[PDB]
From a paper:
pmcThe enzyme 2′-deoxynucleoside 5′-phosphate N-hydrolase 1 (DNPH1) (EC 3.2.2.-) is responsible for catabolizing toxic 5-hydroxymethyl-2′-deoxyuridine 5′-monophosphate (5hmdUMP), a noncanonical 2′-deoxynucleotide that, if incorporated into DNA, must be excised via DNA repair pathways. DNPH1 catalyzes the hydrolysis of the N-ribosidic bond of 2′-deoxynucleoside 5′-monophosphates to produce 2-deoxyribose 5-phosphate and the corresponding nucleobase.5HsDNPH1 also accepts canonical 2′-deoxynucleoside 5′-monophosphates as substrates, albeit with very low reaction rates. The dimeric form is common for DNPH1 and is essential for catalysis. The overall fold is similar to previously reported inhibitor-bound structures of HsDNPH1 and rat DNPH1,6−8 with a five-stranded parallel β-sheet core surrounded by five α-helices.
Numbering used by the authors:
A (entry chain D): 20 to 28, 37 to 54, 72 to 160
B (entry chain A): 18 to 28, 35 to 57, 68 to 159
C-alpha cells in the first residue's frame, strides 16, 4: 500500500483514521528521532496538520522537503492563527501543497486528495 | 576572504539583539536585517539561500515555531553545524524531535537563562 507519514503538534485521530483508508500510516528522544526519520524516508506522502505552531512538525517538514517527498499541509484558518510565512512560502501547488480547511470537512478533503 | 557565515533564526526582542550583537564578534550574521503570499515566497527563497551558504546555524527554540523547525530541518539536511538555544524558564517543553536531534557535536541543544547568553556564545565560538 502507499505509506503515509502523519505529523501533528480529537482531530488528529479523525485524520489518522481517514488516512488509514488510503494507506499504511506511520505515526530515548534519539531513537524516536531516528525512527521517525526512517519512516519519513519510507513515506510516499507526508501529511502535516500545521494549525498549531510546532518546532517538531516544522522540522519533519524540512527533512521531508530535502527528501523530495510529496507533502500535504492542512491548516485551519478559523483558528485565528497566522500560518508561518516559511510554510506558506514553501507551497508549490504540486509537491508541496497547503490546503486551508474547516474542521467538519477534513475527511472529505482527505478523500479528494487521495482519490485524485 | 570570507568570515564564517552565521545564520540566526528565532520566532524576546532585547534577547535577540544581544545574541545577534555577540554573533557579530565571530562572523557575518546573515539574517541581521530581516503580509501576503508573494512576500512569503520571497522570505522563503531568501532564507533558504542564506541557510545553504551558512557555516553555523544558531536557533533560539524557546518559542514553538513551524518556521524555525523547518529551517532546522533544512539545515540538518544541508549538513550544517547547529546550535539550538532553549530557555526552560519559559515553562515550555522543548519538542522531542529537536531534543532528539542533538548529538553533542554538530547539533547541540543548550538550556540557558537569559543573563548568560553572551558567555555561552563565547564558549561555543572561541
Amino acid at each position: 500500500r502507499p505509506a503515509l507519514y502523519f505529523c501533528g503538534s480529537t482531530l488528529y485521530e479523525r485524520i489518522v483514521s481517514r488516512l488509514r483508508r488510503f494507506g499504511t500510516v506511520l505515526t530515548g528522544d534519539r531513537l524516536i528521532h531516528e525512527q521517525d526519520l526512517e519512516w519519513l524516508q519510507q513515506a510516499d506522502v507526508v501529511v502535516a496538520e500545521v494549525t498549531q505552531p510546532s518546532l517538531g512538525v516544522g522540522y519533519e517538514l524540512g527533512r521531508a522537503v530535502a527528501f523530495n517527498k510529496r507533502i500535504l499541509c492542512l491548516f485551519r484558518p478559523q483558528s485565528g492563527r497566522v500560518l508561518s510565512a516559511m510554510i506558506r512560502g514553501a507551497a508549490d501547488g504540486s509537491r508541496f501543497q497547503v490546503w486551508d480547511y474547516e474542521e467538519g470537512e477534513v475527511e472529505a478533503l482527505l478523500d479528494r486528495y487521495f482519490e485524485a
